[PDB]
Write a protein that binds this ligand. Structure first.
Ligand SMILES: Nc1ncnc2c1ncn2[C@@H]1O[C@H](CNCC[C@H](N)C(=O)O)[C@@H](O)[C@H]1O
Length: 274
């Protein structure tokens, strides 16, 4: 099988989501008791870069910096593992960040619905039995797979929002999971195409009544109409205690490296305090 390409792989949004994902993982790993990594929309696994691409404006701009903040080391070491030649050939998606950062006793439950990617994802874990890869509706897995036998977990919800109903399924998906496993860490990625649909989403999430909801947004441009995705963010329910401080240490740096021309913003606030 051939690795999927993706013109947008490793852009600013991946750098943010994968930074945060890796920080949550390293943080859950402080205790030597297994945990579960559930990836509702897992993608293909990795992405062949080039033949160009938005990685030149994103991961390429941080991975070899001499002042790389220590809070990005875990993440950047996984990019490097997949790029031994020292140039950027492949970018690891969420499942391979997990595959590489998780220990032998940990588990991964990964769902990818699209027929193009799903075969590649499955081949990524052909000989990794800590993983279960299935072609299924990711939101459905929040009903079924929780709680995990381990009673510890990071749940990553990273939908493409190519259907506006995604703004719905994420809030009710998280409500379904939270009901069954109220102490897990849920990390929801979101693109800011039209800010309004993000404000609706955040409110429903607030309607849920769930507590301790952190917000981390990195915008490259201002809120714009018909200029595509201007920003992206991670919404973390039950963030590990020092995630907010790590993101305040590292996010200005991220923003100055990814957005050298000074547009946008980079903020770390609480959607629901606890
Ligand atoms: N309902 C869905 N269930 C599972 N997968 C879905 C669903 N809707 C879209 N998808 C796929 O999951 C991917 C969404 N991007 C996820 C990126 C991945 N988490 C990563 O970090 O690289 C795409 O490949 C979608 O085709």
């Amino acid at each position: 099988l051939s690795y999927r390409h993706s013109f947008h792989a490793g852009n600013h949004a991946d750098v943010l989501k994968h930074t945060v994902q890796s920080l949550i993982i390293e943080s859950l790993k402080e205790k030597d008791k297994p945990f579960l990594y559930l990836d509702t929309h897992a993608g293909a696994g990795r992405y062949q870069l080039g033949s160009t691409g938005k990685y030149l404006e994103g991961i390429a701009r941080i991975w070899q910096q001499d002042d790389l903040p220590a809070e990005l080391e875990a993440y950047i070491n996984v990019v490097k593992h997949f790029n031994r030649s020292g140039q950027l050939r492949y970018y690891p998606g969420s499942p391979l960040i997990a595959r590489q950062l998780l220990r032998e006793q940990d588990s991964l439950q990964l769902t990818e619905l699209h027929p193009s990617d799903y075969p590649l994802l499955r081949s990524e874990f052909q000989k990794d039995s800590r993983a279960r890869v299935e072609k299924a509706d990711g939101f459905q897995q929040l009903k079924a797979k929780l709680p995990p036998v381990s009673r510890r977990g990071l749940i990553l919800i990273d939908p493409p929002y190519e259907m506006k109903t995604d703004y719905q399924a994420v809030v009710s998906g998280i409500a379904e999971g939270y009901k069954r496993f109220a102490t897990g860490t849920y990390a929801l990625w979101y693109p800011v195409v039209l800010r309004q649909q993000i404000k609706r989403m955040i409110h429903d999430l607030e309607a849920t009544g769930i507590r301790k909801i952190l917000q981390i947004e990195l915008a490259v441009l201002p809120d714009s109409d018909r200029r595509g995705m201007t920003a992206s963010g991670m919404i973390v329910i039950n963030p590990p205690w020092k995630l907010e401080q790590q993101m305040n240490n590292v996010l200005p740096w991220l923003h100055s490296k990814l957005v050298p021309a000074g547009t946008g913003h980079a903020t770390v606030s609480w959607i629901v305090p606890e």
